[PDB]
């Protein structure tokens, strides 16, 4: 029993974190094989700024060891520093781009030293509600599938509302953001409907049923209601994905949608669900199945 915001074990990623210094700027890098990946802003016309730099301008520290930079290249908003030593702690890994609504673990780092791990979701507006201070750039987001680490996010900046923006490990930003100090703002955000539904199924599994009712709804009527409360539309793909949890609890997805509709229209009435007075949207259907089954890495 119990339901916590759970992150993946971070050990395989901790063994990849390094410190990258160029001039006065210090940030974090990800050392995989013989390459260190980091935000290109560590050096704007980035090609013009990069051409002036030489390998010895980049100081890379792995623990108490200075790595030697033997080459450098830029891929989108990510700088790739070729080093003379392959990371002996390189795990089995992939670079994956995630979609809004998907969750991942963030290993927050400062000066190449991991300080904390938390779980979060890529918001529908492509920002993440992270917890980052100055020095956190280059911190990474990841998931683990069996023994393979899938790197999905690299931290680049904080927006004026306190939310965060970054790229995949190929340097493509999530959202309409640029890596420059200029007027940028997070767009209006929405609630991840399929995730709220997964979390309501997790509450039922844990013995919380007060919000269940005898009613059902059509997908179209639910989406008309959901659009009124700034909730993302629920697709047939989401309904299919929630199939296993529906079969386990005996509550059809559209039956749970009628519970969600009543919660949006009437509120919680002083009650909580899994210790929360708000509808939680940062657990995917897969996270609920994993945490209520005990999958190991």
Ligand X SMILES: CNC(=O)CN1C[C@@H](C(=O)Nc2cncc3cccc(C)c23)c2cc(Cl)ccc2C1=O
Binding site residues, ligand X, CB under 6 A: 1, 41, 132-134, 136-137, 156-158, 179-181
Task: Determine the size of the site formed for a copy of itself (CB under 8 A).
Answer: 51
Choose which of 76, 90, 184, 206 interacts with a copy of itself (CB under 8 A). Answer: 206
Query: Residue from 50, 53, 97, 158 that binds a copy of itself (CB under 8 A)?
Result: 158
> Taking Cα atoms as reference points, which of 172, 29, 189, 11 lies closest to residue 97?
172
The reply to whether 1 sits near a copy of itself by the rule CB under 8 A is yes
What span, in angstroms and rounded, lies between the C-alpha atoms of 291 and 94? Answer: 23
Q: Please identify which residue in 131, 172, 218, 265 interacts with a copy of itself, judged by CB under 8 A.
A: 131
Least distance between ligand X and beta carbon 221 (Å):
39
Q: Nearest CA to 65 among 112, 23, 109, 108? A: 112
- Catalytic residue check, 56: no
* Nearest distance, CB of residue 2 and ligand X, angstroms: 8
| CA pair distance 272, 295, nearest whole angstrom | 27
41 is catalytic: yes
Q: If you write DSSP's letter for every residue of 231-276 in order, what string do you get?
A: BPPPPHHHHHHTHHHHHHHT--HHHHHHHHHHHHHH--TT--BTTB
180 binds, among ligand X, a copy of itself, Cl ion, none (CB under 5 to 8 A by kind): ligand X
Site map 83..122 versus a copy of itself, x via CB under 8 A: ------------------------xxxxx-xxxxxx-x--
We find the least distance from the C-beta atom of residue 105 to a copy of itself, in angstroms, to be 8
Q: Which residues pair with 142 in a beta bridge?
A: 105, 151
CA atoms within 13 A on the CB side of 264: 21
> Which of 38, 41, 164, 257 is labelled catalytic?
41
The active-site residue, picked from 137, 155, 164, 238, is 137
Contact partner, 111, from ligand X, a copy of itself, Cl ion, none, Cβ < 5-8 Å per class: a copy of itself
Backbone φ, ψ for residue 32 (5° rounding): -130, 125
Answer for which of 36, 66, 164, 196 binds a copy of itself (CB under 8 A) is 164
State the binding partner of 210 from Cl ion, a copy of itself, ligand X, none, CB within 5 to 8 A by kind: none
Binder of residue 157, out of a copy of itself, Cl ion, ligand X, none (CB less than 5 to 8 A by kind):
ligand X
d(CA 122, CA 165): 10
Opening angle at CA 147, ends 146 and 152, nearest 5: 85
In the structure encoding, which two tokens stand for residue 238, read together? 């989401």
Among ligand X, a copy of itself, Cl ion, none, partner that 102 touches (CB below 5 to 8 angstroms by kind): Cl ion
Tokens of 45: 């016309």
Token pair belonging to 106? 């963030």
Q: Which secondary-structure segment (H or E) carries 205?
A: helix 193-205
Query: Which helix (H) or strand (E) is 220 found in, with range?
Result: helix 219-228
Least separation in angstroms between residue 206's CB and a copy of itself is 7
Of the two residues 219 and 268, which places its CB atom closer to a copy of itself in the complex? 268
Please tell me whether residue 277 binds a copy of itself under the rule CB under 8 A. yes
Find tokens 């900046």 and name the residue. Answer: 157
- Distance separating alpha carbons of residues 51 and 45, to the nearest angstrom: 10
Binding site for a copy of itself (CB under 8 A): 1-12, 14-15, 107-111, 113-118, 120, 129-133, 135-136, 158, 162-164, 206-207, 272, 275-278, 291-297
Report the catalytic residues.
41, 137
């Amino acid at each position: 029993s119990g339901f916590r915001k759970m992150a993946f074990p971070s050990g395989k990623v901790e063994g990849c974190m390094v410190q990258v210094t160029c001039g006065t700027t210090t940030l974090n890098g990800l050392w995989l094989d013989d390459v260190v990946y980091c935000p290109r802003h560590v050096i704007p016309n980035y090609e013009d700024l990069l051409i002036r730099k030489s390998n010895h301008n980049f100081l890379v520290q792995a623990g108490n060891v200075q790595l030697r930079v033997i080459g450098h290249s830029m891929q989108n908003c990510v700088l790739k520093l070729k080093v003379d030593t392959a990371n002996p702690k390189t795990p089995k890994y992939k670079f994956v781009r995630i979609q809004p609504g998907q969750t991942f673990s963030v290993l927050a780092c400062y000066n190449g030293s991991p300080s904390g791990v938390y779980q979060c979701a890529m918001r529908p507006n492509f920002t993440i509600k992270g917890s980052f201070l100055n020095g956190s750039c280059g911190s990474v987001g990841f998931n683990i599938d069996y023994d393979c680490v899938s790197f999905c996010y690299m931290h680049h900046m904080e927006l004026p509302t306190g939310v965060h923006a970054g790229t995949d490990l190929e340097g493509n930003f999530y959202g309409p953001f640029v890596d420059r100090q200029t007027a940028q703002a997070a767009g209006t955000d929405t609630t991840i409907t399929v995730n709220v539904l997964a979390w309501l199924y997790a509450a039922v599994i844990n013995g919380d049923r007060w919000f269940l009712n005898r009613f059902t709804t059509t997908l179209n009527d639910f989406n008309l209601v959901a659009m009124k409360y700034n909730y993302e539309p629920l697709t047939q793909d989401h309904v299919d994905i929630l199939g296993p949890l529906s079969a386990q609890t005996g509550i059809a997805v559209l039956d749970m949608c009628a519970s969600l509709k009543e919660l949006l229209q009437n509120g919680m009435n002083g009650r909580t669900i899994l210790g929360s007075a708000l509808l939680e949207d940062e657990f995917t259907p897969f996270d609920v199945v994993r945490q209520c089954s005990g999958v190991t890495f």
